Amino acid sequence: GPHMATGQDRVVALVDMDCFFVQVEQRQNPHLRNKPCAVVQYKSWKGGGIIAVSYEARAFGVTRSMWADDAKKLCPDLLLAQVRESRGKANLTKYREASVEVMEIMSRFAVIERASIDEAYVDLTSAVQERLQKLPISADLLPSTYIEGLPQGPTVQKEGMRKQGLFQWLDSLQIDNLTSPDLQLTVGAVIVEEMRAAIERETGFQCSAGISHNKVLAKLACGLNKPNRQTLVSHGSVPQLFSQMPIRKIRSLGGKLGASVIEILGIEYMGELTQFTESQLQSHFGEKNGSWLYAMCRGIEHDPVKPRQLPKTIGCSKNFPGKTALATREQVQWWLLQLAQELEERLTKDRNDNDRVATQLVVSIRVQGDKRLSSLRRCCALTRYDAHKMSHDAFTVIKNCNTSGIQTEWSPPLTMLFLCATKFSAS
DNA sequence: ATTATGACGCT
DNA sequence: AGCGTCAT
Numbered sequence: 108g109p110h111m112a113t114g115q116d117r118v119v120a121l122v123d124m125d126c127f128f129v130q131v132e133q134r135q136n137p138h139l140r141n142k143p144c145a146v147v148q149y150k151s152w153k154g155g156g157i158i159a160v161s162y163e164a165r166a167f168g169v170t171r172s173m174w175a176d177d178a179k180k181l182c183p184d185l186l187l188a189q190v191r192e193s194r195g196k197a198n199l200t201k202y203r204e205a206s207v208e209v210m211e212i213m214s215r216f217a218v219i220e221r222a223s224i225d226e227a228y229v230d231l232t233s234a235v236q237e238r239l240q241k242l243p244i245s246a247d248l249l250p251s252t253y254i255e256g257l258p259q260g261p262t263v264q265k266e267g268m269r270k271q272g273l274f275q276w277l278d279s280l281q282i283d284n285l286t287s288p289d290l291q292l293t294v295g296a297v298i299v300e301e302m303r304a305a306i307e308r309e310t311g312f313q314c315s316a317g318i319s320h321n322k323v324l325a326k327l328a329c330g331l332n333k334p335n336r337q338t339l340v341s342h343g344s345v346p347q348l349f350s351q352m353p354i355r356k357i358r359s360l361g362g363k364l365g366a367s368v369i370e371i372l373g374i375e376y377m378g379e380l381t382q383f384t385e386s387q388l389q390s391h392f393g394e395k396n397g398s399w400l401y402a403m404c405r406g407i408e409h410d411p412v413k414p415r416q417l418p419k420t421i422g423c424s425k426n427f428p429g430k431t432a433l434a435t436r437e438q439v440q441w442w443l444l445q446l447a448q449e450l451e452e453r454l455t456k457d458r459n460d461n462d463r464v465a466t467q468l469v470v471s472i473r474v475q476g477d478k479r480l481s482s483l484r485r486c487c488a489l490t491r492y493d494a495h496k497m498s499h500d501a502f503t504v505i506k507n508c509n510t511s512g513i514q515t516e517w518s519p520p521l522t523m524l525f526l527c528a529t530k531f532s533a534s
Numbered sequence: 535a536t537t538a539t540g541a542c543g544c545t
Numbered sequence: 546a547g548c549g550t551c552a553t
């Protein structure tokens with residue numbers, strides 16, 4: 108009771124851009140706005156692989172990982188934008204630069220953790236304290252906010268439902284104590300409305316957001332009312348929310364571990380985890396995972412928002428599927444050079460922008476016949492930002508992977524090359 | 535023949 | 546270090 112931690116100490120938000128590469132292309136090309144459209148990379152094999160889909164196109168069943176030719180079967184009027192090709196490969200610079208636009212705006216409000224190209228966590232605990240001292244919260248301050256779990260108790264069109272939930276929530280708020288976690292989340296949501304308004308004003312991009320007491324709940328919250336809306340998941344909302352929430356929906360449980368939780372414990376939903384002792388969960392899933400699961404199923408998580416706005420690595424990779432697999436030494440060296448020249452370009456820009464230098468080069472390849480995504484990974488020193496040097500260095504660290512007796516040929520053929528700059532130091 | 539990324543845990 | 550897992 109009196110000593111029972113409730114994980115209500117922080118206000119954390121997760122901001123997730125909607126259909127982000129699509130929005131980047133729609134900003135650039137007005138003709139794509141408010142249309143079923145997708146972003147595709149390459150075009151020769153089956154029309155290209157889809158990596159992003161507008162919500163209009165999702166209504167037809169178009170998804171990521173679909174070939175454009177097949178998506179066209181579902182949606183004949185589907186519009187497509189192609190990822191830039193440079194030096195023979197897809198080049199994601201446009202989307203990395205758009206990401207920086209959003210991340211810099213978010214950083215005006217609080218220190219962010221860059222989670223992916225279009226997602227960032229923010230710890231709003233301090234900003235909420237400040238806003239609290241400056242002030243009753245009007246519904247007008249929360250025009251795109253859902254309160255998860257509401258309305259409840261004794262019209263039915265979506266905006267009506269949203270407002271009815273929001274009204275129940277605000278009506279229940281004890282606003283006179285500056286210590287109420289629910290009030291803190293609410294003020295957090297007011298700030299996120301402001302952040303999201305600024306992102307849209309200043310970039311043209313819309314996004315969704317979750318507000319809760321930790322990163323995992325904020326992330327879960329965010330997805331509950333995509334797109335262009337934000338969702339508040341209170342501590343009190345967790346038992347009902349988790350009672351029907353498949354374990355795989357929770358960040359880090361969407362893979363083998365999550366499947367093992369389901370299989371070993373014979374459960375389906377996050378809420379069912381509460382019936383196990385911490386020691387029981389540790390016994391099955393290890394010390395760290397077990398403690399993490401015990402707290403998480405009660406809505407409690409302690410992973411901090413890390414103050415990191417920049418990626419920790421800068422990498423360049425290309426697959427050579429089917430019989431495009433690299434079988435000659437000339438081929439291997441040409442493509443290592445292409446990758447190295449892109450890497451050099453991005454590295455030089457990074458050093459100018461961000462006052463840092465990578466010190467380690469990681470070289471990864473895949474060989475035809477291997478089932479793993481990476482067959483072999485070797486590091487060497489990265490001492491100069493020089494593409495010819497990096498490509499030569501990469502070749503020497505992998506050249507003995509060639510089982511071919513003659514060194515004019517490469518065997519078994521390479522189906523992936525990967526160069527990654529790591530271990531940055533200030534400069 | 536999804537591809538091109540990127541963070542973090544394990545030993 | 547090199548490899549595996551999990552995620553955009």
Ligand SMILES: Nc1ncnc2c1ncn2[C@H]1C[C@H](O)[C@@H](CO[P@](O)(=S)OP(=O)(O)OP(=O)(O)O)O1
Pocket residue numbers: 123124125126127128129158159160171224225333334537538553
């Ligand atoms: N598997 C994969 N390969 C390549 N690029 C990807 C992949 N997944 C996502 N992305 C890119 C393209 C996306 O626009 C961008 C962000 O991914 P996410 O957030 S999973 O999806 P979005 O396109 O932003 O739609 P959504 O967030 O509104 O659901 O990363």
Ligand SMILES: [Ca+2]
Pocket residue numbers: 123124125126127225
């Ligand atoms: Ca997104």
